[PDB]
Design a protein around this ligand. Structure first.
Ligand SMILES: NC(=O)c1ccc[n+]([C@@H]2O[C@H](COP(=O)([O-])OP(=O)(O)OC[C@H]3O[C@@H](n4cnc5c(N)ncnc54)[C@H](O)[C@@H]3O)[C@@H](O)[C@H]2O)c1
Ligand SMILES: NC(=O)c1ccc[n+]([C@@H]2O[C@H](COP(=O)([O-])OP(=O)(O)OC[C@H]3O[C@@H](n4cnc5c(N)ncnc54)[C@H](O)[C@@H]3O)[C@@H](O)[C@H]2O)c1
Ligand SMILES: NC(=O)c1ccc[n+]([C@@H]2O[C@H](COP(=O)([O-])OP(=O)(O)OC[C@H]3O[C@@H](n4cnc5c(N)ncnc54)[C@H](O)[C@@H]3O)[C@@H](O)[C@H]2O)c1
Ligand SMILES: NC(=O)c1ccc[n+]([C@@H]2O[C@H](COP(=O)([O-])OP(=O)(O)OC[C@H]3O[C@@H](n4cnc5c(N)ncnc54)[C@H](O)[C@@H]3O)[C@@H](O)[C@H]2O)c1
Ligand SMILES: NCCc1ccc(S(=O)(=O)F)cc1
Ligand SMILES: NCCc1ccc(S(=O)(=O)F)cc1
Lengths: 461, 462, 462, 461
């Protein structure tokens, strides 16, 4: 009589299991590790608190971790990102999961606490898998005693890594972490190509708007901005790119984009006078990709072309000043995760008003909120890295080391390039690709082993 | 007035070269901004720079920037086919020693480098080296080691040259420090990739005027050059397949929409004709090597290629293709300079209407420079702004003046700091009319950077 | 509310449908411009239109435009899977007879068309037909021929429908004139191509959430739908191969950068398993049929496809794929609505973990409408502005009231004049914020056109 | 002792022969016609006046006509389009050719005259092959008696067809014509993909400018403007498109381009005030593609960004107001067919002036002027049509008809679709493409023969 879960509808489990079986065939690197390490059971004794979007893809990751011996308790890291049939299949497998699509903020926090607490007391957790740092934060701030037993954190995404490095710099990080984001088979796969697949996917599902011929402004040109700009350009949008980093802006120019600023001469002085109103009045779609705060601000929202679509694909919703819009403008729900924001005022709207914006997923990550996030064959790389990272920190056994050895190992590290390459090779074979083997003379000529690693650690790909 | 200390193809091309320099200067804002920023300070006064890099119009703007900052130079090309003769002539007419022409022999190539090293029959009192590929660096270490005692540093342009510096550093044979100019992002991820995107299809059209759309290409390699090369051909409508030994680069090729294949069955190169994927190579209209490695388009691949396929190399050296095999066994018919039909029917003569030939560009030497003009000015702007900054830095550090114990602590291969890489990029972006946004103080604090940058940790890969 | 003359899935979706209609109106400036232009004149006053076309949000705006101009209508969908239930509910809640829901059986499909034809058990006094594929046209000619005595014209949306009309005209069996709406440039080269570009990869993602980049696709056909479908996949990074019987379309595929292949050895489809290029089909991850032809993805191709390939059809009718063979021999496993795994291990039951299956989308029916929402409003604007102009033209001509000799001269299948095609395009361009330049008198005289257009001869192909 | 020619340098003939031998391997449709018709000699007795760019590809066309039985006398239809090695190879084969790169207007007219006159008297020509209509006009106006002997004209390009249709309208056309341009294997191959290949080719050879990241304005979006826009966009330019035809403008929007006018509201009233100076002041490259007059006018040239490149790929050099620039601005030759135009005045220039434009090929066809025009494998389709059109008209012997039968036969027609498909099939085989054969049931289902034509004549591809 398994009841240790909370999902929208347990009766979706059979559907979710059908999609898990399909997803498994799309995830050869992750399923390869499941088959490789099953005999060793390297996560026997691991008790993992997991906080990451409860999608079908996350389901294959969860069941891999359990297949290698772990126990887990799971929650989503976003109120809109859960696929309810994925959550139901995991719960019907007997795995504690607290997640549904459309949580309130209070339900979101309740779901994390349900993973942390078992029977009203702290679970004897000893591993953390996090995506964005919310679970990491709650443990350090509200359950610090639990971190005495925890061997490490494996952190999925750019924003969570930044938070770990701030903690490390300030002396507040209590356990070591692996930066999963910066494996090449994560950052330069998931963050870029994942958003290429899923950004225009979510815009179409949300609005069914034609994108070809229309004007877009992408704020940011890091890995997510690069993939997002391509998602839109390959549909035929005229894409303009904003950046604060001149190296990233240089890449945008060379990639064929006009680089512009929302602010005259790029100077954001906080006044309406600084807004390039002519530019913003021609933009049909703005997408924020930065991991920064208030990059689509109130004065920008006032100046945007009527009926423009606004969305965010960075981790947190504060990229767009949705607070200003809740305070001043009237919200008309079109359907779940799609709202018309009427700039005519706060108290009610005319149903035929033409002066509105369309906001997707209330400013939360739009690929997961309005579609299904990245596809399985892309998440394969990210999640193979997660598994390898969990194995590595669980085996290092930090929670048991003497203090001097803790000092040497309290760090945020990445996986070695050899492993990054082994993940990539399984991905390539999933496409039917054939990697050539160096001859001994050729390996000697460029100074590498025939087996790799093939590049110095400085190499940027 | 009596300047004779040069050797070029035709000095009367100087006026033409000067017109093209004046145009190129307006395409190179980072480099020309360095010229303006530092001219009064003369930070290279006293520098005596041996330069070895493709004697193009773009290199001319680099040379005159070094001279305008106070340096003296003596120059040669780093490839027998890459000089633009009008550029070398303009530089010579300006009274600057340059020894370079398009279509040098190997003996003339080595003579030209030695003319930069020697002045009036004796070693020039050089104290700086600017190199592209490592040949000048090698000749100095092997043949003129005494000159290195006075040299403060090497600024090395390209991936292959950096590899050779790092081999010397690990072997204990590198005598002076170096800056790896290649690995600035405004070099590696500008020049190596987008430069080849611009100039590869350029050189193939100039050499052959072949339609590329609808035809099959095989690109060997998918590093920065292979990425840019693959894009050069795909954007023309070619059906491009990619080979790689690096699974991470192979993963990128898959995700970028290319089929990843090996010339060898199951990727295993046992040296026999039997290991060749004859069915694959029999379909390929164009093969491009981009690896920096040896014999990646080998004799058995060449025998298996589709009749009338084009063969070329855009890596730094011609040993990527087994051209020696083709010289030894097959008859060469010159179509026009840097374009040869190689007839696979035998060595002693050929039927003029023979159908079983390959077209080789630039005799397997770097094809974008041999058959066209290499990277365009606005891309080389980034590379050469980095070169000027690197020259300034190593010259000001004065390594050659240190005691032996301190030289040992300073001997290293380094990259320029990120802040400079960003400053080059900013001038490039302004040259496109791009407008970079400035962080507010709260935004800078939120992501943990200074408002002025650097904006990324040194681990960032872009 | 008193009004019961409809049948939809759920009338309570009406308000949601109305919200989407108000958005779609802002995406359809040509259609809303016609509403405002002709509202006062009521040119369709007295028209009674039988309509049979995908009951989507876009069709809703079309319906309410005909009504706003004076017409009465009775509506059904031309496909069992293409209805958007909230669009049908909005139309029914506006008082408009509509019989349509997503997921009809075949018997229910036929019944819905008959409910538009009949009002209270007797033929409605229809006088106009709007059709998409020819099913309603066929039912009237076969089963209700008396009704055609009062009907002034048919306006036919799509290529397959027009083919059927032209065969009836040749055979002397077409009883009323038609307008070929499909062959307006703002329909054929807008809807058929760019609509499939937008909506094909859209439906595949919704149905399977598969990564497309780096995978192998085979598009059967390279007409307008095959062009837009091939681009839909290639822009995602698929490696796309194209099959054609028309060498001119195959030439376009080559120049567009696709490899042109046949599923049969040497292109010869003799019906044997030996004729199948099994090596080619064993590498294909996705096959899309775009032909309007029969059995272009046949039993032997289905047998030979790579395990776990996706199979779909974006032509009008589901017989492009041999789904009947799959129904007879293989076990179907529903993943979710309009997504089935087809287990090639046999008919009775399946292993839930079997690896040898295909994924079929929308049971072989038009996949963009079955698994997503079809073309976007801004593209359908062009098709449906043409539909409204075509309805106005044939209604005002009053074919059914003309003397016999006048009928004989007007019994034809025609396209709208090019001047109207241009006026639709102009509104579409303005909807993008584009600005069309006006010729000077001298420039107009020089190319031999009016400043107002038409700008091209009728022979022009764009 | 053959002397009946004039070329730049006859010693270039061996080079030209080498490139002809290579080009033949790139032109399977044209070489296929040599084999299919050699035995029958369909052009035995044809005497063809030919006027078209004397390129390597034209050399293969010429020698195909001769191999099928024709005699010819040849000139180029543009002063800059000749490849001198090609003209030399043709002269050395004993074929009268009068053409070199860099003719004056006087030499251009003289070269056409030498094809018309053999030994000071009109040659007994009975066939005409033209590209642009200059030879056709000269014969109608200056030697009308020779048209009593001529069976027809086969006209290569859109501008030339327009000029023929003016005469058919006015009743002043003396012989029938084949509109070769409007074969699909010409118009939608040569005019579009040909310019795709050769526009960015000529711009690189002429300027070596980076195109990625820069702003282009393409005037026109017919077949040449479509291919031109793609030539630039695929290099990473940000391309804007002007059109007067709203259908063509619709296609540009859908193809992912911003459609703009050089003039406010699109109204070309001839004033400086009409110019959108903000737009023109951002454009790095303008390309005219219209076949119309003065579509890049004096006020657009005055407003263009400093150092922008200006070129024309339409047939005639009056698309750009070069006359205005010759009268008012100082011209500095960079190298052959590349000039800087200094907007500081006419009385000389400062060698370091920054306020100049770069004009390519003096406003003449830039792909042939600064590069080599379309590649062999594209020109294969166009020229296979030219050969079939010459046979199609020669075998009909219009000049032998009585006046009443001539009237009935007098027309400007395209080749039937069956020939168009025959050319396309040979093109497809040259790529190694495999066309599928319809089954009888399938052919019956769509109402075509298994042997084609597969499309009604109304079809637009
Ligand atoms: N939705 C998804 O599936 C998904 C996937 C991966 C990562 N992410 C999230 O997306 C965000 C970005 O990730 P990334 O890996 O691209 O990071 P990144 O560091 O590579 O890129 C962020 C970029 O934003 C730029 N930027 C910062 N402030 C800006 C401003 N005011 N205006 C313009 N540009 C500005 C920076 O210069 C930087 O290049 C993070 O929150 C990350 O966690 C989301
Ligand atoms: N022509 C130019 O203008 C130009 C510009 C920049 C660099 N280069 C030269 O091009 C070469 C490549 O430079 P890069 O920056 O791209 O280096 P890189 O290290 O980024 O890429 C080289 C790639 O070749 C691959 N490779 C090695 N052996 C291989 C084999 N046998 N088969 C397939 N792939 C193989 C490696 O895995 C690697 O990814 C160097 O010689 C460099 O100096 C030329
Ligand atoms: N789903 C949609 O939204 C949508 C939109 C428009 C049209 N359609 C339908 O799509 C179909 C195609 O329409 P179209 O306008 O592209 O027609 P089309 O005539 O332009 O093209 C169909 C192509 O199929 C090719 N073909 C025929 N049999 C073939 C075979 N056995 N193998 C390979 N190629 C073959 C033909 O040569 C032709 O070029 C029609 O049924 C039409 O009604 C669907
Ligand atoms: N250089 C080459 O190799 C080459 C090849 C083929 C044709 N051409 C020539 O190029 C020209 C164009 O040929 P095409 O086949 O594209 O003809 P086209 O009729 O298909 O296109 C010309 C286009 O220009 C547009 N146009 C006319 N006046 C305009 C104006 N003032 N502003 C903007 N747009 C305007 C028209 O609407 C039309 O769409 C003709 O002179 C033709 O002979 C050149
Ligand atoms: N006007 C800015 C002057 C300037 C010009 C160039 C640079 S650099 O990036 O190429 F070192 C830096 C500063
Ligand atoms: N210009 C607004 C009036 C108008 C609105 C629509 C059209 S139509 O081409 O779409 F029938 C024509 C004219």
């Amino acid at each position: 009589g398994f009841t240790d879960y909370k999902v929208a509808d347990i009766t979706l489990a059979a559907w979710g299991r059908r999609e898990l079986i399909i997803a498994e065939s799309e995830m050869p690197a992750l399923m390869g590790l499941r088959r490789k390490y099953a005999g060793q059971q390297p996560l026997k004794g691991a008790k993992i608190l997991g906080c990451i979007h409860m999608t079908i893809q996350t389901g294959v990751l969860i069941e891999t971790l359990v297949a290698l011996g772990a126990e887990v308790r799971w929650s989503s890291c976003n109120i809109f990102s859960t696929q309810d049939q994925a959550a139901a299949a995991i719960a019907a497998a007997g795995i504690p999961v607290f997640a549904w699509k459309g949580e309130t903020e209070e339900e979101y926090e309740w779901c994390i606490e349900q993973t942390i607490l078992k029977d009203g007391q702290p679970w004897d957790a000893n591993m953390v898998l996090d995506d964005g740092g919310d679970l990491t934060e709650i443990l350090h701030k509200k359950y610090p005693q639990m971190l005495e037993r925890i061997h490490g954190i494996t952190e999925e995404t750019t924003t969570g890594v930044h938070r770990l490095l701030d903690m490390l710099k300030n002396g507040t990080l209590k356990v070591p972490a692996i930066n999963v984001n910066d494996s090449v088979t994560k950052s330069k796969n998931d963050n870029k190509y994942g958003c290429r697949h899923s950004l225009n996917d979510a815009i179409k599902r949300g609005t069914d708007h034609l994108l070809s011929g229309k004007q877009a402004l992408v704020i940011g040109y890091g890995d997510v901005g690069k993939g997002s700009s391509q998602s839109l350009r390959q549909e035929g949008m005229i894409v303009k790119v904003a950046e604060v980093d001149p190296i990233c802006a240089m890449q945008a120019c060379m990639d064929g984009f006009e680089v512009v600023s929302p602010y005259k001469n790029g100077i954001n002085d906080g006044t309406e006078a600084s807004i390039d109103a002519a530019l913003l009045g021609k933009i049909d779609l703005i997408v924020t990709t930065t991991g920064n705060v208030n990059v689509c601000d109130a004065n920008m929202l006032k100046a945007l072309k009527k009926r423009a679509v606004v969305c965010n694909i960075g981790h947190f919703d504060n990229e767009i000043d949705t607070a200003f819009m809740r305070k001043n403008w009237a919200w008309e729900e079109v359907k779940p995760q799609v709202h018309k924001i009427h700039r005519t005022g706060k108290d009610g709207f005319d149903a035929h008003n033409d002066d509105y914006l369309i906001l997707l997923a209330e400013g939360r990550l739009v690929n997961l909120g309005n579609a299904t996030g990245h596809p399985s064959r892309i998440m394969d790389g990210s999640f193979a890295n997660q598994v390898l990272a969990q194995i590595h920190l669980f085996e290092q056994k930090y929670a048991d080391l003497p203090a001097a050895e803790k000092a040497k190992r309290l760090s945020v590290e990445v996986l070695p390039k050899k492993l990054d390459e082994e993940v990539a090779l399984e991905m390539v074979k999933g496409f039917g690709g054939v990697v050539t083997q160096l001859t001994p003379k050729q390996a000697e000529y460029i100074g590498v082993s025939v087996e790799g690693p093939f590049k110095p650690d400085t190499y940027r790909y």
